[PDB]
Amino acid sequence: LGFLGAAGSTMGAASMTLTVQARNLLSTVWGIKQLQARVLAVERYLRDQQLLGIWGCSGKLICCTNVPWNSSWSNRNLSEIWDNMTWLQWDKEISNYTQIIYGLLEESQNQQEKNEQDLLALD
């Protein structure tokens, strides 16, 4: 499947297709407009890569972070989320809470890296 093969499919079945939607992010009168759009696409991909790498999840598609999830954010059972819902309604009802989640991931990565350098220096 090419563009958006599982944009409405099963949540548990949409985790087998993240590669094809991530493989294609880069592939005078109009000598400046396409240049600006192409540089903007490059910085969009680079911002995404740096935001992945800032919490220790670079080069790995599905990465895991040890920070917990509060009950005031979603309060919904996992089984019917992963077997009934889609991605679009999740982005509809979670996107207002994303900044504090990103801050929590950044703080957890900072704590993990500081324990790592403390363990490396103490040994």
Partner 1 sequence: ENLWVTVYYGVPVWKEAKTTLFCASDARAYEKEVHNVWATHACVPTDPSPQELVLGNVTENFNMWKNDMVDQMHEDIISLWDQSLKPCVKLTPLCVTLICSDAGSGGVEEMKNCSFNTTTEIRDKEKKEYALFYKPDIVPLSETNNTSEYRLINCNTSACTQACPKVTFEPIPIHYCAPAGYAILKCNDETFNGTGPCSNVSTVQCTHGIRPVVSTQLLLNGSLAEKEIVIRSENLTNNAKIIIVHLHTPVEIVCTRPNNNTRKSVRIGPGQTFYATGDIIGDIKQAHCNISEEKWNDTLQKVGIELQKHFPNKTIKYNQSAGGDMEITTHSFNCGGEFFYCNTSNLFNGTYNGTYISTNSSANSTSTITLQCRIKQIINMWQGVGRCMYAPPIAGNITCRSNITGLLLTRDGGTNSNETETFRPAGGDMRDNWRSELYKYKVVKIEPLGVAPTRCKRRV
Among positions 24, 72, 96, 99, the unique one binding partner 1 when judged by CB under 8 A:
24
- Start-to-end CA distance of the chain, whole Å, equals 50
* Residue 8 CB, nearest approach to ligand NAG (Å): 6
Q: Which residues contact 42 (CB under 8 A, 6 or more apart)?
A: 26
Residue 30 interacting with partner 1 (CB under 8 A): yes
Question: What whole-number distance in Å separates Cα of residue 6 and Cα of residue 86?
Answer: 9
State phi, psi for 66 to the nearest 5 degrees: -80, 0
Residue type, 36: Q
Residue 39 interacting with partner 1 (CB under 8 A): no
Residue 105: CB atoms within 10 A of its CB come to 19
Residue 9 interacting with ligand NAG (CB under 6 A): yes
Residue 44 interacting with partner 1 (CB under 8 A): yes
Rounded to the nearest angstrom, the gap between the alpha carbon of residue 98 and the centroid of all alpha carbons in its chain is 11
Interface residues toward ligand NAG, by CB under 6 A: 8-9
**Chain residues that interact with partner 1, rule: CB under 8 A:** 1-9, 14-15, 17-22, 24-30, 33-34, 36-38, 40-41, 44-45, 48, 51-52, 55, 57, 61-69, 74, 78, 81-82, 87-88, 90-91, 94, 98, 101, 104-105, 112, 115
